Amino acid sequence: IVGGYTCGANTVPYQVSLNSGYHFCGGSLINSQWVVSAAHCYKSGIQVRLGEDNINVVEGNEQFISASKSIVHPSYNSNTLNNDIMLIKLKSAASLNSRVASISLPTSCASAGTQCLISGWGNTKSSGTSYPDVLKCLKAPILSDSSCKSAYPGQITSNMFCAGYLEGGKDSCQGDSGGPVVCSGKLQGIVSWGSGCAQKNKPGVYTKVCNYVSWIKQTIASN
């Protein structure tokens, strides 16, 4: 997260870290056994780390649970990034508590101009690299469909939306992929892609979670 702030320990209790001997993506806890992340975050042998703040120090509220199943959307395309969503099933159910909690799915799609909370452990610089120990947060608005498409001609599908600041300086970045965009207490987006980070006229691009709610519930019911 570039241009954000230190969230505060366990203030985003649905935020998880996906770990392969290092943090590589975020994710969102949607019930005690399932996490939503980005399809491009898929890898075998993932450990899900819940209750984290400082990802490099054991602070006492963590649960580390292996992924037992990873289910990428059937129509994911790694070239276009269309349908960039994955569901991870935990080998055992997380113990839900004040620091490990689910985020609700949407009942409708969000609107342009709605301020959302984006979070993660990704890069905090728009040029170069600085990776935080603790979770970072950013408030950013959903952009209009027309502004999103203007920013990325030919690349925005009906399964994506833009959020952020066209002047630059405030955005998600590498290491934030798969993590949440929460608006009005619902999970509306998944960090997906952008051109650079926090660049002028290059807002963040997010998977539009409201298009997938039936698929998510059906996948959970059958796996």
């Binding site: 290092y22 943090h23 590589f24 993506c25 980005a38 491009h40 975050c41 890898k43 276009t80 990034l81 452990w121 990704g122 890069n123 990776y131 690349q155 998600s172 970045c173 590498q174 290491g175 934030d176 992929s177 798969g178 960090v191 997906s192 892609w193 952008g194 051109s195 650079g196 980070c197 963040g204």
Partner: peptide, 12 residues
């Protein structure tokens, strides 16, 4: 299109 995995999408 640059995905937002750490350290990068291409680096893995």
């Amino acid at each position: 299109i640059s995905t937002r995995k750490y350290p990068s999408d291409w680096e893995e």
